[PDB]
Amino acid sequence: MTQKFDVVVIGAGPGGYVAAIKAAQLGLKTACIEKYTDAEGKLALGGTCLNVGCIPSKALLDSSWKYKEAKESFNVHGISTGEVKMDVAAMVGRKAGIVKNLTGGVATLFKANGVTSIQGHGKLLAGKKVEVTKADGTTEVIEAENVILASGSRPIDIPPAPVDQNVIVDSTGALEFQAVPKRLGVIGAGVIGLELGSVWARLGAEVTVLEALDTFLMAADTAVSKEAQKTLTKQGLDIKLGARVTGSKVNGNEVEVTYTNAEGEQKITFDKLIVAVGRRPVTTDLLASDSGVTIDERGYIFVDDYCATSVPGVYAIGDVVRGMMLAHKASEEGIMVVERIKGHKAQMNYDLIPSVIYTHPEIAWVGKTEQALKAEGVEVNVGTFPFAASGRAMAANDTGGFVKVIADAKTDRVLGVHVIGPSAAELVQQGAIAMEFGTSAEDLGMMVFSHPTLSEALHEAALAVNGGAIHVAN
């Protein structure tokens, strides 16, 4: 009595669970396999994003920001408090409650949509056959007409500082500290390192970020990255570029890190060290030798522009394949794939995928950067508006940053929108929507924007493109 499904999804992350639900919505008998469990051995959907990634980081970022603001920015509004203290265990407990509630909601969506969730390790055998390994080493083989490989990724482990889930930890561990470490070191100045570094810095940690690369957020706009580094150094993140870690020595509750930069070989001791150099795609026991699915030199599963593998009916989405390792990317690929299975001539749009960094000020952008377009030989018009001139921002006592719009000098078509400041993610989305309809700098500048709102910064930025802004001289 072999079980049979129309679609089998291996993995329950932003790519996997969305796909499963979407397949069920289209009448496909879907099953979603997942090995990840909560702290009591029970199934936990939502992947990295929900369990040890996106949500958790945002929870601690919001709580840690409310503490920093209460200590320094409350006086200005006339608000006094006594001493302001943070109980880390309770901060982390609030986060756990949020995660537990959200994971339970995905399970609710699965039941309501009719998705059969299976708890175990899934492996793709030959002939779209899937082997599920139960907790007690028992094996069951299930039949699938379509398979969606969505195993995501894991953190990179570096030889000089191997993680030991105690003094040296990865992103997952850095979300579990039960006390603020006096001295915190972070390897990797990327999005993850900066968010995790910001949290503990706000709570009193002496944070040092050792980045081996000579650049800082090179993917972002030169102006946005120059501002982020300046603002983040003020917040207590001692960001050191061109610093390569060569070794570490754990001693009791301390670790002495050894690195090399332009000046020579230095040493620094931390109470806790977070390794966050990047993430590698996961395919551990995911494929049988004769499954027919090819892996690439860097660990990613080969797929075409539609996330289809060599094998008919076998697709691979999210972090385990090429592209930006973002949750919304994975999700959209999941939807694109399911529609393709149902026969739609679907293809998602990779050109307008925004990126968001949840530091404070928030950073986000969509489209091309100014420096990438100078190298591409495109003459552009640049308009910017600082939040220092936004009335809404002044009311909120959060005036740092700006909005930058980039248009083509000949057509006036908006080629990119970049923001660093309050509600940056929302302003960038407004830009993305406009660009989707192929907006010009003029088109946005002619629209009616609410007053007073943070959205106006995008409006003044668009007008400033062609030197027609009202709230900043041209």
Positions marked active-site: 451
Who's near 74: CB < 8 A, 6+ residues apart? 80, 81
Partner in contact with 21, chosen from a second copy, ligand FAD, none, beta carbon below 5 to 8 Å by kind: a second copy
CB neighbours of 252 closer than 8 A, spacing ≥ 6? none
Q: Report 176-195 residues binding ligand FAD (CB under 6 A).
A: 192
Work out what residue 47 binds among a second copy, ligand FAD, none; the CB cut-off runs from 5 to 8 Å by kind.
ligand FAD
Question: What residues form the annotated binding site for FAD?
Answer: 15, 34-35, 48-49, 58, 122, 153, 319, 325-328, 451
386 sits near ligand FAD (criterion: CB under 6 A)? no
User: Closest CB to a second copy among 106 and 130?
Assistant: 106
> x/- contact string, 438-457, with ligand FAD (CB under 6 A)?
-------------x------
Region near ligand FAD per CB under 6 A, out of 28-36, 74-82, 201-209, 458-466? 28-36
First vs last Cα of the chain: how many Å apart? 75
The partner residues of 43 in beta bridges, in order of sequence, read 37
- Give the shortest CB-108-to-a second copy separation in angstroms: 8
What x/- string results for residues 262 through 301 when contact with ligand FAD is judged by CB under 6 A? --------------------x---x---------------
The position carrying tokens 């299976």 is 118
Residue 188 or residue 318: which is nearer to ligand FAD going by CB? 318
Which of ligand FAD, a second copy, none lies near 441, with the C-beta cut-off 5 to 8 A by kind?
A: none
Q: How many CB atoms lie within 10 A of CB 234?
A: 9
Chosen from ligand FAD, a second copy, none, partner binding at 36 (C-beta under 5 to 8 Å by type): ligand FAD
Q: What is the DSSP letter of 158?
A: -
Binding-site positions for AMP read 211, 245
Task: Label residue 40 exposed, middle or buried (CB < 10 Å: 0-12, 13-18, 19+).
Answer: exposed
Whether the link from the prior residue into 361 is cis, omega within 30° of 0, is yes
* 221 is a site residue for ligand FAD (CB under 6 A): no
Q: From the annotation, which residues make up the binding site?
A: 15, 34-35, 48-49, 58, 122, 153, 188-195, 211, 245, 278, 319, 325-328, 451
Nearer to ligand FAD, 124 or 341 (CB): 124
Query: Dihedral angle at the C-alpha atoms of 295, 299, 305, 307, nearest 10 degrees?
Result: 70
Question: Binding site membership for NAD(+): which residues?
Answer: 188-195, 211, 278
Q: Please provide the DSSP assignment of 266-316 as one string.
A: EEEEESEEEE-S-EEE--TTTB-TTS---B-TTSPBP--TTSB-SSTTEEE
Q: List the chain gaps (C–N > 2.5 A) by preceding residue.
A: none
Q: Give least dist CB 415 to ligand FAD, A.
A: 22
Residues found in the chain:
474
Q: Which is nearer to ligand FAD, 151 or 440 (CB)?
A: 151
Q: Residues 6 or more apart from 133 whose CB is under 8 A from it?
A: 120, 121, 122, 123, 139
Residue 261, token pair as written in the block: 């930069």
- Angle between helix 54-72 and 191-202 (nearest 10): 40
354 binds, among a second copy, ligand FAD, none (CB under 5 to 8 A by kind): a second copy
Residue 406 near residue 458, CB atoms below 8 Å: no
Q: For ligand FAD, which is the closer residue by CB, 129 or 413?
A: 129
| Binding site partner of 105, from a second copy, ligand FAD, none, Cβ cut-off 5-8 A by kind | a second copy
> Which chain residues interact with ligand FAD by CB under 6 A?
10-16, 33-36, 47-49, 53-54, 57, 121-122, 150-153, 171, 192, 282, 286, 318-319, 325-328, 330, 358, 451
